[PDB]
Amino acid sequence: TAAENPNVEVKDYGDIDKAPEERARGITINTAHVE
Numbered sequence: 001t002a003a004e005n006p007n008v009e010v011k012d013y014g015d016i017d018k019a020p021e022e023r024a025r026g027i028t029i030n031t032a033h034v035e
């Protein structure tokens with residue numbers, strides 16, 4: 001969507017599973033919100 005709208009911040013995979021636990025287990029643990 002950010003290709004169509006400059007007003008969308010892109011979030012990459014590692015920006016979403018960013019927690020130290022998530023990295024340690026290699027899964028999502030926390031809900032993440034993106035726009």
Ligand SMILES: Nc1nc2c(ncn2[C@@H]2O[C@H](COP(=O)(O)OP(=O)(O)NP(=O)(O)O)[C@@H](O)[C@H]2O)c(=O)[nH]1
Binds near residue numbers: 026027028
């Ligand atoms: N071959 C292939 N692998 C994919 C595809 N989409 C995601 N993956 C791979 O599958 C693995 C899991 O993706 P991920 O997005 O982290 O899964 P999840 O459903 O978010 N995780 P969890 O249930 O822990 O939240 C990753 O290694 C990713 O590269 C796809 O289209 N093709």
